[PDB]
Amino acid sequence: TTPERRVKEILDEMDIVYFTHHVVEGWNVAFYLGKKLAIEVNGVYWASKQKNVNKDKRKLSELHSKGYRVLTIEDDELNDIDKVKQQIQKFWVTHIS
Amino acid sequence: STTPERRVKEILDEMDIVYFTHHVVEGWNVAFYLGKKLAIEVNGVYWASKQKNVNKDKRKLSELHSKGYRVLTIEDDELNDIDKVKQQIQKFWVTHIS
């Protein structure tokens, strides 16, 4: 139904464990996979989305500066799950291994 | 800047309400399960990845109800007026949990 729900289902299929809506360095991420690996879900727009480019930008720069690798999945990309699974795959394999 | 589910979570945290996230009750997946057969769902008119299938929503609610479950559905757009969603959740909680 929701982007997060869809990402969760992919993670379960790949048998990947995670903390949901987990706080890291004062920031919120959709899924935390450990070893400073996080997945975020975003999109150009949704009804209750309050735009803030500077905040979103700062968030990534701080996390990255602290050793975090963040994979941001766009809600549109979900209509092509085969590509999303690929992004999650590469992300997990190249960073956890 | 935050997903609808994230925004609902923050509300629950503020009200000091505990939950299972993306929980499955009677074969149906809910965004937040609060126990005592209480759940909160997050939906909306339509978004980027949403596939319209009301025949699964009309079924979900009707079946859960007969099993004793009570589901509060929050539309993504409702979050723009956060106070309205807080009072819904507050009343929902007090109603079935008193």
B49 contacts chain A (CB < 8 A): yes
Q: How was this structure determined?
A: X-ray
Residue that has been written with the tokens 């106070």 in this structure: B83
Write the single-letter amino acid at A11: L
Spatial distance between the Cα atoms of B42 and B9, rounded to a whole number of angstroms: 11
Q: What is the DSSP-derived secondary structure letter of residue A44?
A: S
Three-state helix/strand/coil letters over B9-68: HHHHHHCCCCCEEEEEECCEEEEEEEECCEEEEEECCCCCCCCCCHHHHHHHHHHHHHCC
Q: Is B37 left (phi over 0), alpha (psi -120 to 50) or beta?
A: left
Tell me the CA end-to-end span of chain B in Å, nearest whole number: 34
Going by CATH, does the domain composed of B1-98 fall within 3.40.960.10?
yes
Cβ-based contacts of B76 with chain A (< 8 Å): 46-48
Give the homologous superfamily in CATH for domain A1-97.
Answer: VSR Endonuclease (3.40.960.10)
Cβ-based contacts of B20 with chain A (< 8 Å): none
Spatial distance between the Cα atoms of A88 and A68, rounded to a whole number of angstroms: 15
